[PDB]
Coordinates of C-alpha atoms and ligand atoms in Angstrom, one line a residue:
X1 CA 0.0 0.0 0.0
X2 CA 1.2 3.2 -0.7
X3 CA 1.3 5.2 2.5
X4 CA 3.1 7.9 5.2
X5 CA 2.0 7.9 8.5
X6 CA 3.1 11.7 9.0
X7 CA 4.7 13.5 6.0
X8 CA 6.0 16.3 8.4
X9 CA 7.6 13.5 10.7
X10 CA 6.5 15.2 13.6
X11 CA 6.7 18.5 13.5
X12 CA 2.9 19.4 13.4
X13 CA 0.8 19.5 16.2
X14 CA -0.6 17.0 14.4
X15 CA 0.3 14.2 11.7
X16 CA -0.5 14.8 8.2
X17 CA -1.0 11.5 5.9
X18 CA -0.4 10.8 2.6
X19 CA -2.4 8.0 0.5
X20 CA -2.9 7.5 -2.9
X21 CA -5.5 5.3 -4.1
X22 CA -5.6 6.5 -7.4
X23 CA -2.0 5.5 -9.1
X24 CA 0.9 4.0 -8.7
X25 CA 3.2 7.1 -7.7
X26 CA 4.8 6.6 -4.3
X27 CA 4.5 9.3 -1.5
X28 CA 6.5 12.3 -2.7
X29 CA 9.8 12.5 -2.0
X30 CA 11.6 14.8 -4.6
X31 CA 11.1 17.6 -1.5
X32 CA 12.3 18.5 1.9
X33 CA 9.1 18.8 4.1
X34 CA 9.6 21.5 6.8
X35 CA 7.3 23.3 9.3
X36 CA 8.7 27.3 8.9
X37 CA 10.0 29.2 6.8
X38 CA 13.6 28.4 5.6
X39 CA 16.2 30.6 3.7
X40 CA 18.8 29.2 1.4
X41 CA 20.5 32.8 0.7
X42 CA 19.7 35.6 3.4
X43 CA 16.8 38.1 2.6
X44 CA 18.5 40.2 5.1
X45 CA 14.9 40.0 7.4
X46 CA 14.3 43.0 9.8
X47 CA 14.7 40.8 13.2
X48 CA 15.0 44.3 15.4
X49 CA 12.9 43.6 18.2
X50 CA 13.0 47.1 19.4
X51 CA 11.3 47.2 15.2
X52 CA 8.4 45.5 16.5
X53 CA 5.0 47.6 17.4
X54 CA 3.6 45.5 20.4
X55 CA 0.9 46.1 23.1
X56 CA 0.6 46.8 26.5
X57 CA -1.7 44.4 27.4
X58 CA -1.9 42.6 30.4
X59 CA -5.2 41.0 29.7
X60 CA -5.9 38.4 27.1
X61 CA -6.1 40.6 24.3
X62 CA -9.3 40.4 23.6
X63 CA -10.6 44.1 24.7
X64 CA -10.4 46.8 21.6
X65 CA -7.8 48.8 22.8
X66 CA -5.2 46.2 22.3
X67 CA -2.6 48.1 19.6
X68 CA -2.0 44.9 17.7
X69 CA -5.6 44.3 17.3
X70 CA -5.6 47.8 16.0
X71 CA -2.9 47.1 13.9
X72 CA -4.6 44.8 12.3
X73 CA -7.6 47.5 11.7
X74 CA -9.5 44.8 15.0
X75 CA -8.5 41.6 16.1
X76 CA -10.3 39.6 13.9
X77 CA -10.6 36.7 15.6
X78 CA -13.4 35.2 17.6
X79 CA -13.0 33.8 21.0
X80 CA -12.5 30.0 19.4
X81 CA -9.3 31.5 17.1
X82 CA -11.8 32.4 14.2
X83 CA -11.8 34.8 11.6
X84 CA -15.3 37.1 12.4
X85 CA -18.3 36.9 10.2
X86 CA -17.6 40.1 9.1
X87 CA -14.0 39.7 7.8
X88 CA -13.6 40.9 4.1
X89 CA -12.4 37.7 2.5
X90 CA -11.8 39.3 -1.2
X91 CA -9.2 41.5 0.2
X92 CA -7.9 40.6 3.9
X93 CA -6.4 42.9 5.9
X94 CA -2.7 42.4 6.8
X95 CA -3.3 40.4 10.6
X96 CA -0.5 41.3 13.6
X97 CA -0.3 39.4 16.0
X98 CA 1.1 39.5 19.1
X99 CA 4.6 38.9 19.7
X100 CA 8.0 38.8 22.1
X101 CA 8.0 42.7 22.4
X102 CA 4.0 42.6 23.8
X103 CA 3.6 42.6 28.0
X104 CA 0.7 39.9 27.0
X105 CA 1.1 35.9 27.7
X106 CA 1.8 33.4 24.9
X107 CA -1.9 32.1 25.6
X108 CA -3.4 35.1 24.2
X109 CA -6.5 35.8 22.0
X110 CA -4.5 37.0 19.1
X111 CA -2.2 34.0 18.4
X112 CA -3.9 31.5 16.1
X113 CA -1.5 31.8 13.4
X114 CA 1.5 31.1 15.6
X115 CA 0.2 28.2 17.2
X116 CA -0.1 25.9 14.4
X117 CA -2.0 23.7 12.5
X118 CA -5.1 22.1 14.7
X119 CA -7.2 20.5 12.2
X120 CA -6.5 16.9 10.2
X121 CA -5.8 17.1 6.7
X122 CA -4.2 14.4 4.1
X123 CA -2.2 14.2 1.2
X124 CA -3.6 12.3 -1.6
X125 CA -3.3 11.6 -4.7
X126 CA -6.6 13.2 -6.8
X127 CA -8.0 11.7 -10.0
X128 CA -6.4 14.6 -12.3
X129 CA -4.6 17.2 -10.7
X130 CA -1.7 15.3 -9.3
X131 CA -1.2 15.5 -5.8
X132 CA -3.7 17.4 -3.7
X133 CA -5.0 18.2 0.1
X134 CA -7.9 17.4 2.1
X135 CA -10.0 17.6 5.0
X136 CA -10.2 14.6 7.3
X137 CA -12.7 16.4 9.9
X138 CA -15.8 19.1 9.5
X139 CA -13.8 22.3 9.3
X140 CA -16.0 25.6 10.3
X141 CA -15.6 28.6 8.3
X142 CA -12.8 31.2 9.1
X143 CA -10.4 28.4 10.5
X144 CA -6.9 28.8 10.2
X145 CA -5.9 25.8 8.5
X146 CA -2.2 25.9 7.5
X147 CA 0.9 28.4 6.6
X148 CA 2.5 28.3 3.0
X149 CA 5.8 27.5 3.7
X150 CA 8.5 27.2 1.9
X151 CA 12.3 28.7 0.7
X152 CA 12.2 32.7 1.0
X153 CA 14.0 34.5 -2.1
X154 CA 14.0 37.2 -4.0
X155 CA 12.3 38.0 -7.5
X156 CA 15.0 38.0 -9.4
X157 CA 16.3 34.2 -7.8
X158 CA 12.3 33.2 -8.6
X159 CA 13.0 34.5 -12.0
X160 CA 15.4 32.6 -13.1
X161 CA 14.9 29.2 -11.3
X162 CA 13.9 26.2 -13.8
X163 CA 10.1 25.8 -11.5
X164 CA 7.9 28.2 -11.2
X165 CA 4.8 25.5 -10.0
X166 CA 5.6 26.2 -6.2
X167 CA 6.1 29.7 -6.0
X168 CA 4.1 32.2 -4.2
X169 CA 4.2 35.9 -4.8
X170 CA 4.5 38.3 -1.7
X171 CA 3.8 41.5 -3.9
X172 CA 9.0 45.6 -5.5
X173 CA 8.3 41.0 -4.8
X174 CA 9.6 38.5 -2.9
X175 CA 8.4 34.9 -2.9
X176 CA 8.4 31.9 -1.2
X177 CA 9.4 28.5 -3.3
X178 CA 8.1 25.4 -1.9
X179 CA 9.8 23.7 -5.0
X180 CA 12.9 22.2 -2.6
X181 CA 11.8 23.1 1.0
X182 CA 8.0 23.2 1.6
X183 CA 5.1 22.3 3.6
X184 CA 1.8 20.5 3.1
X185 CA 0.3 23.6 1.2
X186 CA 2.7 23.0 -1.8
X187 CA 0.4 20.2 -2.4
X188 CA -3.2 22.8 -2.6
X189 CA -4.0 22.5 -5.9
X190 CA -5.8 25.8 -7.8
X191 CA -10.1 25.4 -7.5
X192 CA -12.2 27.5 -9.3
X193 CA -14.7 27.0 -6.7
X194 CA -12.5 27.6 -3.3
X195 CA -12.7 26.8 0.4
X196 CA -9.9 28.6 1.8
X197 CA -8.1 32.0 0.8
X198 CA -4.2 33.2 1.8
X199 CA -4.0 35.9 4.4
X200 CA -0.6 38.2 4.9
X201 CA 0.3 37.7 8.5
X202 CA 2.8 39.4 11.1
X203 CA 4.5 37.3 14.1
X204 CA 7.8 37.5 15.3
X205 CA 9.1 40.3 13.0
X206 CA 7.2 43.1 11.4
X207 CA 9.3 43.4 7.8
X208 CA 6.7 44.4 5.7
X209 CA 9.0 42.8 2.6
X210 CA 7.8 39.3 4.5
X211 CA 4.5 38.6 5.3
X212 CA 3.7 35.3 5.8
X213 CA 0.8 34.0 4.3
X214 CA -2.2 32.1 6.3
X215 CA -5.0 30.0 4.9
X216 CA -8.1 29.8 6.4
X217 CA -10.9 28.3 5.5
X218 CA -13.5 30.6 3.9
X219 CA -16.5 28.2 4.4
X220 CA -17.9 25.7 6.2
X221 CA -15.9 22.9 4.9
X222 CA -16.9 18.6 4.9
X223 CA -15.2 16.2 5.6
X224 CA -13.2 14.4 2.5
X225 CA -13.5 17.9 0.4
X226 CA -10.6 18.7 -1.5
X227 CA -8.8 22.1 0.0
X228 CA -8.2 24.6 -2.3
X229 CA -7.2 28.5 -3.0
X230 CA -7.6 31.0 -6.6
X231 CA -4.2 30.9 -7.8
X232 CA -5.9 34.4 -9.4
X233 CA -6.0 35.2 -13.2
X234 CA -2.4 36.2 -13.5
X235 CA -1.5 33.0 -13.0
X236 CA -3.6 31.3 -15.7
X237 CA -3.0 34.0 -18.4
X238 CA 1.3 24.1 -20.5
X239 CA -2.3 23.0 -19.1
X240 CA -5.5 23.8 -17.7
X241 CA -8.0 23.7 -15.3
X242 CA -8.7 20.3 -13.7
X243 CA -10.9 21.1 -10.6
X244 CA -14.3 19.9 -12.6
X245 CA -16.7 22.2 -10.9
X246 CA -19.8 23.5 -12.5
X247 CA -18.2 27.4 -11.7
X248 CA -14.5 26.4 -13.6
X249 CA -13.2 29.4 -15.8
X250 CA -10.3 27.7 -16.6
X251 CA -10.6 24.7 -18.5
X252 CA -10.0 23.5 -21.7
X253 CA -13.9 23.9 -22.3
X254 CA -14.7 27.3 -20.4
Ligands
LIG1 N1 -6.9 23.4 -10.9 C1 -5.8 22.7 -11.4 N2 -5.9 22.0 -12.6 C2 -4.9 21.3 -13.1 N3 -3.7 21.3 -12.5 C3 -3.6 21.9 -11.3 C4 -4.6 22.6 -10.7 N4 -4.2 23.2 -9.5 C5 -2.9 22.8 -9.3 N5 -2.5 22.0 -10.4 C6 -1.2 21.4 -10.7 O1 -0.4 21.5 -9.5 C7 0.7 22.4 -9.7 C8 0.7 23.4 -8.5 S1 1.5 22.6 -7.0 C9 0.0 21.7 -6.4 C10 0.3 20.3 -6.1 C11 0.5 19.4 -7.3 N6 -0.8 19.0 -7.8 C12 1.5 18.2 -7.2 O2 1.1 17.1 -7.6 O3 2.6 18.4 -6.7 C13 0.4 23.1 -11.0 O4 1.6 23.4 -11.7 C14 -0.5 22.1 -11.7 O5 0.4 21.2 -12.3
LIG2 ZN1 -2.8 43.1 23.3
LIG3 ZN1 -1.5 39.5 23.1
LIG4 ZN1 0.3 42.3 21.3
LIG5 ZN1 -11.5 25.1 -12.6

């Protein structure tokens, strides 16, 4: 049987499986799976933690005169660690949360992102899109589900690099490669009908060069649905649109 236990060997909070029960191509190995952010060459990241804007909160965080909740326009996250109702999902805000330089805990309200990936997911192997993600559980809407992580470089290293299928752009552009060094999102294929969208996120350093980016789920989500993001028009404009919804604006077809 073709089969991993845990693709990120323990580095989750929880294990992430792979299966394929589609093909005969084993588990993916022609990448190194890591749980944050890596550099091959340095970006030269802001790390100043005298750089970082912070609060003086000595609470939970969860009143509206925390700074990094204003930072962040409100905290905009629910008492559970979801994104509100209200949250503009076609153009998130940039999220900060709170960090080394705050007078907060480490068990505050504004620290979803930082704590990790919560909910069960699993690499598989999908009929036509190659390798893919998906829910194991019932995922509510605005749950963060997992960081795109990968190898941080500039545009002109992601210009000239042989694969372009792992990159994503943090537009003056940066990018971060999951080609060589990523996580389980380099496996989220493109759907034209999608349940989770990238958010820019602030934790430990505030260089605005460097957001990292979030996914959360932008709907109720069931279990065994495929997870997926809009890899935007850019990208679209070698193949074409495999996600076979009844919405899909970039097949062959439509
Ligand atoms: N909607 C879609 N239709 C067809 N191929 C897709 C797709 N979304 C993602 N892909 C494929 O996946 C690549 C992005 S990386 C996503 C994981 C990939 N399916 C893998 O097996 O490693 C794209 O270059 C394309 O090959
Ligand atoms: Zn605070
Ligand atoms: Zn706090
Ligand atoms: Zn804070
Ligand atoms: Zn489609």
């Amino acid at each position: 049987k073709i089969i991993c236990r845990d693709v990120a060997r323990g580095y989750e909070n929880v294990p992430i499986p792979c299966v394929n029960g589609v093909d005969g191509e084993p588990c993916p190995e022609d990448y190194k799976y890591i749980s944050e952010n890596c550099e091959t060459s340095t970006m030269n990241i802001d790390r100043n933690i005298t750089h970082l804007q912070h609060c003086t909160c000595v609470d939970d965080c969860s009143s509206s005169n925390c700074l990094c909740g204003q930072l962040s326009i409100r905290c905009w996250y629910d008492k559970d660690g979801r994104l509100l109702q209200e949250f503009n999902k076609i153009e998130p805000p940039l999220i900060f949360e709170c960090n080394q330089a705050c007078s907060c805990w480490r068990n505050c309200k504004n620290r979803v992102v930082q704590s990790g990936i919560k909910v069960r997911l699993q690499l598989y192997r999908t009929a036509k899109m190659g390798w893919g993600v998906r829910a194991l559980q019932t995922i509510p809407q605005g749950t963060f589900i997992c960081e795109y992580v990968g190898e941080l470089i500039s545009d002109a290293e992601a210009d000239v690099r042989e694969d372009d299928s792992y990159l994503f752009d943090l537009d003056e552009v940066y990018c971060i490669d999951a080609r060589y060094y990523g996580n389980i999102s380099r496996f989220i294929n493109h759907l034209c009908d999608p349940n989770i969208i990238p958010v820019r996120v602030f934790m430990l350093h505030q260089d605005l060069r460097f957001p990292r980016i979030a996914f959360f789920s932008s709907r109720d989500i069931r279990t065994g649905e495929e997870l997926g993001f809009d890899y935007g028009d850019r990208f679209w404009d070698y193949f074409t649109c495999q996600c076979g919804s009844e919405k899909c604006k970039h097949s062959a077809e439509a």
